[PDB]
């Protein structure tokens, strides 16, 4: 079917300049144009612009001088530059196919790449186990704390696990690095036989952390 | 540019019962709209398109409305799974643009928190910081109280809460709250309480562990 | 009435 995925989220310095590579399947690129968009805090959803099949490129009034768009149709891929970045133009980007060749109901989205406008460094997580010590159920999870910047991923046993999964916002520490815990709920009677992980991967720091959550 | 007013800003409402989203444009846009759904961590899903008319996959209680500057988004049967927020999006000027969004609510019957305490790791102890964690989950209302005390001393200040979107299955809350200390403040101490107040318990809830055991 | 990074929701 028809897909977008988009390249890894993470940090661009003050002034400098932002690259993302959407890779498109189930459709080629001759066919059909790619948009961009974002979504900030302080504008909402905002449309910076496109590149068309046979090449042609439109950007939004205040993105025309600082943004390029171009593609590989034979790689199916389209490049995202902007340039000179400042902390306003922290965002998710998305990619995006609309429906029809030439129009804008935008059907099918990137998941997205969170871009974080910062002089501060990278820094991976330390991950450290919530143990479980009422009604035969069991509370565990994982404390993913100290990291920069957003975002951090949490699954369960390789994505087995989902029912009963509270992953909760990430609250930013007042050194500012960020933390997160992710719970789960379980039978108190599968401690014994089951094992818990939390995976973790913080993809900007290439920190890639599997966490297995004993009773202590 | 086409400036798109939404309202209201938050919409509450009960499973079953009928909602409707507002989407005002500062000039004429014909039928020219598409609404979008978008859930917690996820993209903007295409509900709508063209004011009316209908999308591949997405399921029939969703419909639209409207021509010239007042258009409707409507739900005539709320499901628990529609939690999300709701924008609008405008495009017969360039360049096309979109409403702020309604975030939709969910009523349901008031469930109180299951409350779990979880002291610092030995792990954590090594790197010279102690975080205690204190659980409250799957309760509703959204509205909890989360009191901290070490060894009967009132802890204010050093705490943070996280609280989860609704449950896209039974509209619930969970929320996290964390104690942080430095590691000397935790070996000077014995008794680390975390206590919960909430609407669905009849006294609050103390759940607590001696350092140690 | 903010989107929020984190949570990808509107938030106040």
């Known amino acids: 079917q028809v897909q977008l995925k988009q390249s890894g989220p993470g940090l661009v310095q003050p002034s400098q300049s932002l690259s993302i590579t959407c890779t498109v399947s189930g459709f080629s690129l001759t066919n059909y144009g790619v948009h961009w968009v974002r979504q900030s805090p302080g504008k909402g959803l905002e449309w910076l612009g496109v590149?068309?099949?046979?090449?042609?490129?439109d950007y939004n009034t205040p993105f025309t001088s600082r943004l390029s768009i171009n593609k590989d149709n034979s790689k199916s891929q389209v490049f995202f530059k902007m340039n000179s970045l400042q902390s306003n133009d922290t965002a998710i980007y998305y990619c995006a196919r609309a429906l029809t060749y030439y129009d804008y109901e935008f059907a099918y989205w990137g998941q997205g790449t969170l871009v974080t406008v910062s002089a501060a460094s990278t820094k991976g997580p330390s991950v450290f186990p919530l143990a479980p010590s009422s009604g035969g159920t069991a509370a565990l999870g994982c404390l993913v704390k100290d990291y920069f910047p957003e975002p951090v991923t949490v699954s369960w046993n390789s994505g087995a696990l989902t029912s009963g999964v509270h992953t909760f916002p990430a609250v930013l520490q007042s050194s500012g690095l960020y933390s997160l815990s992710s719970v789960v709920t379980v039978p108190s009677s599968s401690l014994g036989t089951q094992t818990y992980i939390c995976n973790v991967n913080h993809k900007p720091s290439n920190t890639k952390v599997d966490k297995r959550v004993e009773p202590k | 540019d086409i400036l798109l007013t939404q309202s209201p800003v938050i919409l509450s409402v009960s499973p079953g019962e009928r909602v409707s989203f507002s989407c005002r444009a500062s000039?004429?846009?014909?039928?020219?709209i598409h609404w979008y759904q978008q859930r917690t961590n996820g993209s903007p899903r295409l509900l709508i398109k063209?004011?009316?008319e209908s999308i591949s996959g997405i399921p029939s209680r969703f419909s639209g409305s409207g021509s010239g500057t007042d258009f409707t988004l409507s739900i005539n049967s709320v499901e628990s799974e529609d939690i999300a927020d709701y924008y609008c999006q405008q495009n017969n000027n360039w360049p096309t643009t979109f409403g702020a969004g309604t975030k939709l609510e969910l009523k349901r019957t008031v469930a109180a928190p299951s409350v779990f305490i979880f002291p610092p790791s030995d792990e954590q102890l090594k790197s010279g910081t102690a975080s205690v964690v204190c659980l409250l989950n799957n309760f509703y209302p959204r509205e909890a109280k989360v009191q901290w005390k070490v060894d009967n001393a009132l802890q204010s200040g050093n705490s943070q809460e996280s609280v989860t979107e609704q449950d896209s299955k039974d509209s619930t809350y969970s929320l996290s709250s964390t104690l942080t200390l430095s590691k000397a403040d935790y070996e000077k101490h014995k008794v680390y309480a975390c206590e919960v107040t909430h609407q669905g318990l009849s006294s609050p809830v103390t759940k607590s562990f001696n350092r140690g055991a | 009435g903010q989107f929020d990074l984190s949570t990808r929701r509107l938030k106040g």
């Open positions: 590149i068309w099949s046979g090449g042609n490129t």
């Open positions: 063209y004011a009316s």
């Open positions: 000039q004429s846009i014909g039928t020219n």
